[PDB]
Amino acid sequence: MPGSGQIQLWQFLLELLSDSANASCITWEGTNGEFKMTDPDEVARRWGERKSKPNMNYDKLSRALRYYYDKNIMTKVHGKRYAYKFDFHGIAQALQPH
Amino acid sequence: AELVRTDSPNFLCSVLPSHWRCNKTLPVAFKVVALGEVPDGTVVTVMAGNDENYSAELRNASAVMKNQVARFNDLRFVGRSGRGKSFTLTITVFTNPPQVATYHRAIKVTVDGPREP
Amino acid sequence: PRVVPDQRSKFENEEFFRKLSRECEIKYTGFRDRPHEERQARFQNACRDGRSEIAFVATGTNLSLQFFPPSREYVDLEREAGKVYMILNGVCVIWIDLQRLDGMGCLEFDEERAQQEDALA
DNA sequence: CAGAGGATGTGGCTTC
DNA sequence: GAAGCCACATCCTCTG
């Protein structure tokens, strides 16, 4: 699906979770789907580096992520400073039918 | 505001522009006029008709006749028509019996409103 | 004027009407964003109330219907199992699968009311 | 101030 | 290739 050819967030963001050398800026938080946000504005910076969008900040990237809610890609861990989680039981209805 | 013909010459409605974005605050709200004397209080709903996705999603689609002029706070077109394709939107007036005026080539509903390409 | 002077002519001359004079492909358009189960109940309870929303898929023409002047000859759920049997553009005119929420239907010029209505002028 | 969210332009990418 | 999509961009707003 067009996640393959053109770069996403969730496809991109998880180049940094799985990779040990980028934990400088994020990490898996636990057994269940969760993730921390280390530098909230170095994160956004590299997403600018890729998107060729130098103006990028958290506020910008973040909004994009808050869209995902209504589409059932990921969801928020309420009250936690900058931690959401991925819905995979829905990424596969969002990448395959029934 | 400005008006246009119908397929029932007893009622008229707004000039809904050529091509617009999926679900926007319309550039001119929707007025629907009663030339035949209608009890100010009668309901009016619209249904987007097109060979493709024959009933599109709409918002604030129901309105109340008042002073012989039913106005829609803000109608919004969600269900897209397709490429080159517009809506023949139906227009109901809830009475005994109810009456309808078809309206061919109403508006082209795409995701982008026409940006300079 | 609720109707056009040549009520019979418009029905037998307008591409719009003759394109709907033949038995066409129709379907229930109510609550499109709802599960097939809810749509089935809503559509049946509503028919029993004497109303619904059906549209000619082929042409794109939608309608909100009222089966009246509860009835008998306007909404019959007996003529067949698993299914059930106005003034359009100034012209007095007159089945869906209870599971598929689709079927066939058409328009028929109303001579009776065409006269009654025309007489009101 | 974070966090959900409407509105509206933007840019890459399939489809006629 | 404009004409429809797409999945953010960039925006200014509330409201806990």
Side-chain angles (χ1 to χ4, degrees), chain A residues 1-28 30-98, chain B, chain C:
Chain A
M1 208 35 91
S4 52
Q6 161 64 342
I7 313 102
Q8 294 285 122
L9 280 176
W10 72 283
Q11 205 191 223
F12 162 80
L13 285 175
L14 305 193
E15 177 179 38
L16 325 166
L17 253 77
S18 70
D19 181 43
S20 318
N22 275 331
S24 316
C25 298
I26 190 155
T27 175
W28 280 96
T31 182
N32 213 306
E34 319 177 353
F35 51 88
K36 167 75 185 173
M37 190 89 59
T38 307
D39 190 338
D41 299 308
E42 179 83 315
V43 161
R45 200 203 50 77
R46 277 206 202 166
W47 176 238
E49 194 176 37
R50 176 57 58 78
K51 291 288 259 206
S52 320
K53 207 71 73 157
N55 306 62
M56 182 60 70
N57 73 351
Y58 186 91
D59 279 343
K60 284 163 165 187
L61 166 145
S62 66
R63 181 69 204 82
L65 304 178
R66 301 197 214 90
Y67 273 130
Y68 280 43
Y69 285 56
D70 207 24
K71 324 176 177 163
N72 299 196
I73 306 143
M74 72 169 57
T75 182
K76 219 292 190 193
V77 194
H78 309 293
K80 291 213 175 172
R81 292 164 307 277
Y82 317 153
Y84 300 27
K85 67 174 184 175
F86 297 85
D87 190 14
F88 296 119
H89 212 309
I91 283 267
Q93 198 76 354
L95 223 42
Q96 262 297 295
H98 105 312
Chain B
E2 199 205 327
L3 269 178
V4 72
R5 286 184 217 139
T6 47
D7 296 12
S8 189
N10 200 36
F11 298 85
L12 303 172
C13 72
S14 323
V15 184
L16 297 167
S18 57
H19 161 220
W20 205 241
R21 178 150 190 161
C22 163
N23 190 38
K24 247 214 181 99
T25 49
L26 284 166
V28 175
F30 203 45
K31 276 220 267 255
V32 164
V33 170
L35 308 186
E37 287 196 321
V38 171
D40 298 333
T42 274
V43 181
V44 178
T45 43
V46 311
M47 280 137 291
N50 187 225
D51 47 5
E52 311 283 320
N53 73 278
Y54 55 88
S55 178
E57 188 161 323
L58 305 176
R59 284 167 52 180
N60 305 345
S62 59
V64 180
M65 184 67 72
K66 207 234 72 178
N67 189 30
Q68 301 292 330
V69 176
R71 289 198 288 273
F72 298 72
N73 190 26
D74 176 45
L75 188 67
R76 287 185 201 173
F77 284 100
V78 184
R80 277 113 293 146
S81 326
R83 190 188 176 80
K85 281 173 177 183
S86 308
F87 279 118
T88 307
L89 67 93
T90 276
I91 326 167
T92 309
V93 178
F94 279 53
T95 61
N96 299 329
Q99 318 180 148
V100 162
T102 59
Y103 177 36
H104 174 248
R105 64 184 183 279
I107 182 154
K108 184 142 69 188
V109 178
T110 62
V111 37
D112 332 87
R115 290 193 299 285
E116 266 67 12
Chain C
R2 308 222 318 163
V3 293
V4 301
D6 42 63
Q7 216 161 311
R8 185 60 160 292
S9 312
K10 182 161 187 165
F11 189 97
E12 304 186 319
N13 280 59
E14 224 68 66
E15 175 55 47
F16 169 81
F17 282 111
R18 59 183 47 182
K19 196 70 171 196
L20 296 169
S21 296
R22 328 302 164 163
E23 182 173 343
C24 287
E25 168 189 25
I26 64 178
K27 292 182 183 172
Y28 177 60
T29 58
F31 308 89
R32 291 288 303 285
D33 71 315
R34 307 309 313 152
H36 196 65
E37 194 282 334
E38 181 181 310
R39 294 197 74 221
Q40 271 169 150
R42 286 183 170 283
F43 165 83
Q44 177 146 293
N45 305 315
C47 282
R48 296 177 184 289
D49 292 3
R51 57 181 158 71
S52 195
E53 306 172 11
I54 300 78
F56 307 88
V57 182
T59 183
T61 307
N62 294 232
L63 294 172
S64 206
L65 300 174
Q66 283 183 182
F67 318 118
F68 260 113
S71 82
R72 313 283 185 169
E73 74 196 70
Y74 296 94
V75 45
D76 166 40
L77 312 87
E78 277 58 52
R79 177 175 166 181
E80 187 165 353
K83 60 177 63 174
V84 300
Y85 282 86
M86 76 168 83
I87 305 171
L88 221 186
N89 297 340
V91 176
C92 290
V93 72
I94 303 176
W95 52 271
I96 296 298
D97 187 285
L98 291 177
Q99 295 191 336
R100 301 184 60 202
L101 310 181
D102 83 76
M104 304 283 132
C106 80
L107 292 177
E108 183 144 302
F109 180 72
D110 192 321
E111 200 85 50
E112 268 285 36
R113 301 197 69 268
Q115 253 67 54
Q116 304 173 193
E117 211 73 58
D118 219 314
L120 300 175

